[model samples]
Target: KVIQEKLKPDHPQTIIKKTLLKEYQSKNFSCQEERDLFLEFTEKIVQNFHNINFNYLLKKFCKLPENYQSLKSQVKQIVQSENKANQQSCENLFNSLYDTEISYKQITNFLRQIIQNCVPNQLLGKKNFKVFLEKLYEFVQMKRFENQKVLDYICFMDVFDVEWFVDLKNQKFTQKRKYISDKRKILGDLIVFIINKIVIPVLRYNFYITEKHKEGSQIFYYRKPIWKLVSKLTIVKLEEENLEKVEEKL
Candidate 1:
């Protein structure tokens, strides 16, 4: 007969349980004003995510609005007025007229639509319940590594599993015991996933930016960290295979 040894206290499940219990207890003691403040903080995070996507899209695409027609006309005039031999010299001046015309409002709306349609609704849903907390944790971690301040806050909260409260409230010992075991495995996997998908890509992309701009150019360069991270995480299978081989060789 196999005898199972008692689990260690420093295990992931124990750590998460301790942290979550603290958070839940704090909430229980919170005043109405504190609760309101928490809600406001959450709303601000959502708004910040919307704004980051908008700004990143605008920077990457050099998008401008129809209202900037005057600027575009000025650019055309400058391009036309330049001497034939020095036509290329006017490129910068021509681009400048409309380069500053990124439509902040339009980009904001577009980002909202994209987030609504593309990102998982389970994570963004109105319910505060813990059903999707693990996936939400992963998403927030990914966003944090992309340099989104709001997501960083959410990710910090997700380092702990609060679902233990549900089992405790329901007085389900069997389920709670299973959950305790599962929590340890989940936390370990979460760390590995975050390191492979979020941290590594962030470091690599930042390195790319530094190298690319080592000798700066005249034209503005746009690098969206989210796009870079997503590309690395969701690459084609062939590309992934090649990357794995390259890593092995290194």
Candidate 2:
């Protein structure tokens, strides 16, 4: 047998297109306009990542559903008629669909934003987010040991041990590193731990009712509600009973 290799487009925008296309193929949209809106909304979201390739990938590519023209005309309608609710509904409609397009970059942004939400603006003026991740990691590690049995069953969440613990402490949070996958995975596991250990416990009791996704019991929370509450609250420490429910989740 000979060496086999396949070429793939690795532009972050192309990856976003691939993600959107995958979801497009898997899910059934309710109407032509809704499908069009999804393509437009997805392109809009990916613009936050990289806008240069929106037309090239989504418009020129053949696999994606046709929406460029329809979305344009509807957007024109919004401008001419100035329907505020229509524009608002565009965001609302996309909320359910947007999560599927998330990748390493979006998750990183979400993680950074959540950390920014936690720390005071005065402290954030000089120190970077890595400091806060470290701080949160300290809190998470202690919590992991606190409910060692409950956490053991969660599956593939084995980042609490000494080896990985040392890896996080030693690594610098910079872009020149070759181990982007490792960084992404580390940040993701941090998000999983932070949500379970900190965010859920705070929300479950006072403000929001938490639940698992339809897929199963996993690290799940409504990002908008959770983020809103987190921005307003300072989490100095978690309470005892909420700590018990955190394990009761599994």
Candidate 3:
């Protein structure tokens, strides 16, 4: 309770005064904090297509856990505070999405910084991390994007394909202009922002990432790890505690 007493007034886990969980469960927007967050994100609601919101809608309006603060800050903590291999911090991040206040890109960058700075362990590679990896695909699918959609394709991961093979495939085509017109819509304005404005510009400064692509659809891998150790595996760290045993048991 001492720890509970010290949290900031606005902290998500901090409770309301004079209220019980049951009492507050049915409440309306109780404060300017709630209402402002509502009106702010509602601006993004209208859709270009489909029966659903644009994407990652539910995670939009809430407060992220204050403990994680910012990814850069968390990375700083890891380097300084010896919370290095912070399993709770790491797993708690990927264990759930949207439940936390941080956005997918924030989380992606968070995991990315962890991957960039920390030692790769067995904790990074395993079964439970599939959710986190799946969320990366979901992260890219969400509407969190830069305004220019042409340039930042792989930067924010705003541009990817199930198969550009459809464009490249030997399917019948009326004319190449149709294909040119077809792929134009593939990366829209907002989607291209990160590609050009963010990634390419950064690459000119020698900040480019490896532009690698490969097929990973087989049953598994060489080391007999539960899943294939592919590039996405960088986003998670499997705790090495008897991973050798876990792999053998599987």
Candidate 4:
């Protein structure tokens, strides 16, 4: 008893989808050698992006969920085994946040500040970008097992879930969880922040430098169009055409 309406080609959703699809079209690479090198660099970026648990890692570094008793014990176990100073420092940070029975608003506000503020910006030159990359390597290189432990804890406890918070403090987990693409929206937010704030600017600058001058970009080490670079890096299929009209055949 119901009829479906046809999607106009100029509809907002259609325009948005077309733009997104355009991102998948591969642009030409300047040189084969540079293309190969850039591909390797992209592989590392994607590899790290997947391998790193951004939220849990950040939470661990910042000593968060400071009042969670079980997580505290886990932290104690690790800290006790490592540096003597680290244990005290970790406890100090934990205690700083644990000072009050924090409301959800307080927790999110604190976390938003921490998450949104830490990313670097205004990196203008190749040297600064290289320095940024070097620091990123150092950050990712250090604190491996510690992050793994926190990530494991997060998985087991469902730390970001509403129920998890409800179990800890009955009323604080008052809101429903937002879901996205079969995962918690909160977990994806850190990645989104990093991509938009940290990665895009670096890539944009690198693109400009590579496109304008010689092939001697100190950071990028190669030249490629932004769209092609993104398409290859993301490994999305190069869609040359749209095969079917949703309304036409149906």
Candidate 5:
């Protein structure tokens, strides 16, 4: 509701008509053209979501064969120029496109800019995005599975409901001291996996996005594999045997 209120017109078409007639009585545009432009602009404003399909709208307006070629050429040039500019410029074009209700070219340029900024290169397929994803997946899986045995032990200890071994700082309990020590070892290994397999990879990818490469650096050299970070810890009681291991090692 809030978004709609922010985007929607405060006045109806009747009010707009009266205001425009009073303010621009000498304008040469026909009433139908004025109405069509007003409706297009207002619809974009009220929807608020940036998914407006400006291409369709442009085709609709360009059906008038007389003005088609000239208007189409002008809009195409505007779109290209807007896309080449920075992010702020792109945003301004979006605002003007919605406000003036002019050519759909502005909206198309805005969409292109957004796509270039957010989606990962691998998802885009224009380059070697697939190879990057594959390598990243392998690295992440290997790190997670490297110490399967230790993960199994940790899962076993967790099932027993033992607090001394599970608590990283509690070093005084001697009853199940060996088990505690083993649990700590597994915990350490898990931490290592998290840092090497997950954290560093994500940070490196983000760095790649913003970093400027040297002249000879293959653009692919700057491409980092994007990986997901996962953390899991589960607790289960001791007597629950065959209860399907409280925690399954990934």
Candidate 6:
């Protein structure tokens, strides 16, 4: 267990939970939000104190020969069921080592944040946050597929781009995006696409003034939270007026 989880003299959750209870009981019906936060604090049992414990649990649960079959369907189901049970109740699992539900959207958000070192302390506390990684790999499995035949249909002299064929096969088959395809935009685009499909977006974004020329952004005719916003962060030199895209980079 980490130190914050226990008060120096009394265990972390002990002091925190005590304070929460005191506030709740003394000033009942006032601090309802604190009560909600508290419900998650001591939500369940059989959980660990942090990501390490959960990772250890997830890894061990996924492994195990008995899980497949010693030819005992009864024992196999029984063994995997506990792991499945633990997997399903994430509040217990997250709070056990105790933390957030940590939706998959954060994968790219975290990727962008790590560049600025904006990750949370609880996440950084884990020695190896394996669970975070597996989700990233899993979400990136979505890829654009086209059944169109090869570009050259018995055309001119042979120009073999063997690597292209290999990469085309690799992208469609594997969940991991190890190879970059010429047809795709960004490698991470696929990851973001897949994750977006599974979890709804929590934050809505809009760029209005900066890229004003694009579609209806400048018109104010068609505007929305995710679609339009007049006061955006783009214009590198707002006073300069109608700056070129090349200059925006500078």
* Best prediction by TM-score: 1
TM-score, candidate number 2 = 0.20
lDDT of 2 at 36: 63
RMSD values, in order shown: 17.7, 23.6, 22.8, 27.9, 30.9, 29.5
- Tens digit of per-residue lDDT, candidate 2, span 1-250: 1111110114444555565666332133334653464355445535544533322322232122244344335434543444123425445333432332222233334344443444232221223234444343323223211322222322333222212222333344443243333433433433343344333332232122222343222322233333332222212112323555576687
The lDDT of model 1 is 0.34
Q: Tell me how far the alpha carbon of residue 150 in candidate 2 is from the true structure, in angstroms, after superposition.
A: 21
User: How much does candidate 1 score in TM-score?
Assistant: 0.28
TM-score, one value per model: 0.28, 0.20, 0.17, 0.22, 0.18, 0.16
Compare candidates 1 and 5 on lDDT and give the better one.
Answer: 1
Identify the runs in model 4 with alpha carbons over 4 angstroms from their true place: 1-29, 65-130, 133-250
Query: How far off is model 2, as Cα RMSD?
Result: 23.6
* CA displacement after TM-score superposition, residue 3 of candidate 5 (Å): 46
Cα-based lDDT for every prediction: 0.34, 0.34, 0.28, 0.30, 0.30, 0.25
- TM-score-wise, the better of 3 and 5 is 5
Residue 194 CA error for candidate 5 (Å)? Answer: 0.3
**Which residue ranges in model 5 land beyond 4 Å of their true spot?**
1-174, 208-250
Higher-ranked by TM-score: 1 or 2? 1
Residue-level lDDT of model 6, residues 161-195, one tens digit each, is 11112233335445433332331222122122212
